[PDB]
Amino acid sequence: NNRYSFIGGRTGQWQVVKIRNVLGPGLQLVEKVNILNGAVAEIPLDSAWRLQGFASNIRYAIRTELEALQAVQPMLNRAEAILAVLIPIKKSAQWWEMAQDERRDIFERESHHTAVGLEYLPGVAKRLLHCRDLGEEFDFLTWFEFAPEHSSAFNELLLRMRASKEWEYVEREVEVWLKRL
Amino acid sequence: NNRYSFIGGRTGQWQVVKIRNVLGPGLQLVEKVNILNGAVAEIPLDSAWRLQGFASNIRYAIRTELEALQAVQPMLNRAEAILAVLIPIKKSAQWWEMAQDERRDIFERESHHTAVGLEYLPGVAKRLLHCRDLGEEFDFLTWFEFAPEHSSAFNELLLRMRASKEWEYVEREVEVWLKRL
Ligand code: HEM
Ligand code: HEM
């Protein structure tokens, strides 16, 4: 199954280190994040929030870009990658009104998202989930995993992305730093 | 809400004229199709199947094509559009493994999906729903509406699409012809 849930509450595989409400309404601080694949009948109500999103096909990356990405992309679930960051993202209506060529021009031709991200592989593992189509308050759920030696590089990557043209359209963003249990 | 459900059963707004099982397993023949804006978990006891999908953002149209479609696309529920066709589609895994430039090259440079379809606007209203990401048996639900005069034109359009390179990646297809009640 391609559906994933992120439950903010008192159980989970990850301990919340901090939450940084970068832009827009934030997320209440909780003790742990519970990650679930597929639907489960019971998710605690004593939980604070529940995000979700699905893995999907490629939307912008071209073939040569994939080849370069799959050649340095690390796997999730590395013993050393005891730190994780969940960054839900929402883009503005203005971004979604645009055609495919206009969004590709902004995503890569101007902002070089993928060329910038490749500099931080294989130290940082990154997965993408889509959730605009589910009516979720966010449009994406980005997931990052890496060893603590890469914390400075990752914090540098965040600031690079936020200074790009593509992030002029982001109107809601939160950082949920996690430590593995 | 951007979710739509198509209940094949004994109730609904549309009367099933015929179902043609074009490619792969088909859909049981029913009396009517009931269309609901929203998801439907439990399905009426008198129903035979349920299809669902969501309206989403553009995945392939460049802005020159989008402005042409939007200036010509007709509404839904035209007084004369008493015929409707529901065509669920499923593409192969080889298609979903490809990158965005590869899939776009086939979708337009080789098949001319948008250039071909535009010839049959404004006669035929056309709406696209996505459902691969929900885990449905189909990848897309396509919805058409037209007056009986444009029924032959629609059938020619179908011939053209099915002879394109894009349709060599299709592995399941069914036609559910409908009449407005
Ligand atoms: C090593 C670091 C990174 C790499 C290799 C990378 C690569 C990519 C690639 C190739 C895509 C396109 C996916 C597709 O075509 O469907 C993408 C999408 C995306 N990335 Fe990243 N990225 C990185 C860092 C980040 C960071 C730090 C964030 C947020 C802070 C982020 C947020 C997003 C979002 C929101 C999308 C969805 C774009 C859209 O559909 O509008 N990425 N990324
Ligand atoms: C007037 C006739 C038609 C027009 C104007 C038209 C237009 C379009 C456009 C512009 C797209 C791209 C949407 C996007 O970029 O997200 C598309 C996709 C699609 N069309 Fe058509 N089309 C027509 C006829 C048909 C027919 C007859 C079928 C099936 C028998 C069909 C099946 C599909 C499918 C399955 C997709 C999704 C392709 C994908 O995402 O890989 N279309 N159509």
Side-chain angles (χ1 to χ4, degrees), chain B:
Chain B
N1 206 301
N2 74 320
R3 188 79 68 90
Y4 295 82
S5 302
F6 301 77
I7 319 302
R10 319 249 200 211
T11 41
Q13 310 95 338
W14 299 81
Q15 192 180 273
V16 178
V17 169
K18 70 170 165 210
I19 298 183
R20 199 68 295 282
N21 306 305
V22 166
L23 179 93
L27 293 177
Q28 171 70 210
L29 181 57
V30 293
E31 303 189 5
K32 306 168 134 156
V33 165
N34 195 17
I35 305 207
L36 297 167
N37 183 37
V40 174
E42 44 155 337
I43 327 164
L45 299 108
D46 63 55
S47 99
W49 40 259
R50 179 186 101 280
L51 305 176
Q52 57 159 357
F54 51 83
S56 193
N57 52 284
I58 287 293
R59 320 302 191 81
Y60 294 115
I62 74 188
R63 203 44 152 131
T64 65
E65 295 163 351
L66 216 54
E67 239 181 281
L69 310 144
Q70 297 177 319
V72 182
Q73 172 93 245
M75 38 180 327
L76 301 187
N77 202 41
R78 291 173 289 173
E80 79 257 6
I82 50 139
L83 302 179
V85 191
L86 172 68
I87 307 186
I89 301 280
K90 190 191 189 189
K91 292 184 188 199
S92 66
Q94 285 75 21
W95 167 264
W96 298 109
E97 180 131 301
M98 291 164 75
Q100 184 61 18
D101 64 319
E102 310 177 291
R103 272 176 283 105
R104 159 70 190 200
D105 276 2
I106 293 155
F107 173 81
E108 202 51 32
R109 206 217 93 72
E110 319 229 34
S111 302
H112 309 291
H113 184 120
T114 317
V116 170
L118 250 181
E119 294 184 12
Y120 299 85
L121 302 199
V124 184
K126 202 270 176 148
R127 304 294 198 262
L128 172 73
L129 296 176
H130 296 90
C131 64
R132 177 163 201 262
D133 303 319
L134 300 190
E136 284 286 326
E137 264 187 359
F138 289 103
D139 290 335
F140 315 96
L141 307 177
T142 55
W143 176 257
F144 303 89
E145 296 183 4
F146 43 86
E149 45 248 46
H150 310 117
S151 285
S152 49
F154 185 71
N155 275 295
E156 199 173 75
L157 166 66
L158 280 169
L159 286 165
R160 295 174 71 176
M161 286 294 183
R162 274 146 200 194
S164 76
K165 184 73 153 132
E166 190 205 351
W167 242 263
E168 302 185 24
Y169 289 86
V170 173
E171 52 179 50
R172 194 178 180 199
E173 186 175 12
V174 306
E175 300 178 15
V176 179
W177 288 72
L178 298 167
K179 177 190 91 173
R180 203 162 89 234
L181 289 169

Side-chain angles (χ1 to χ4, degrees), chain A residues 56-62 65-66 69 72-74 85 87-91 95-96 100 103-104 107-108 112-130 139-144 154 157-159 161-162 166-167 170 173-175, chain B residues 57 100 103:
Chain A
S56 196
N57 61 276
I58 282 307
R59 314 293 183 92
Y60 298 110
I62 59 135
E65 285 167 14
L66 284 172
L69 200 91
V72 298
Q73 179 155 41
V85 193
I87 308 196
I89 303 277
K90 192 199 198 142
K91 295 189 185 196
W95 162 267
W96 296 110
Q100 177 58 22
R103 274 175 282 114
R104 164 69 187 183
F107 173 77
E108 196 61 17
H112 304 108
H113 186 114
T114 297
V116 169
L118 260 195
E119 294 177 36
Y120 302 94
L121 305 198
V124 178
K126 192 273 211 165
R127 291 330 188 243
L128 172 63
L129 301 176
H130 306 249
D139 294 341
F140 309 90
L141 300 173
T142 61
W143 176 261
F144 308 87
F154 184 73
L157 161 67
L158 290 190
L159 298 177
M161 295 265 146
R162 279 164 196 157
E166 142 177 34
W167 246 258
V170 173
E173 177 170 7
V174 175
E175 294 183 22
Chain B
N57 52 284
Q100 184 61 18
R103 272 176 283 105

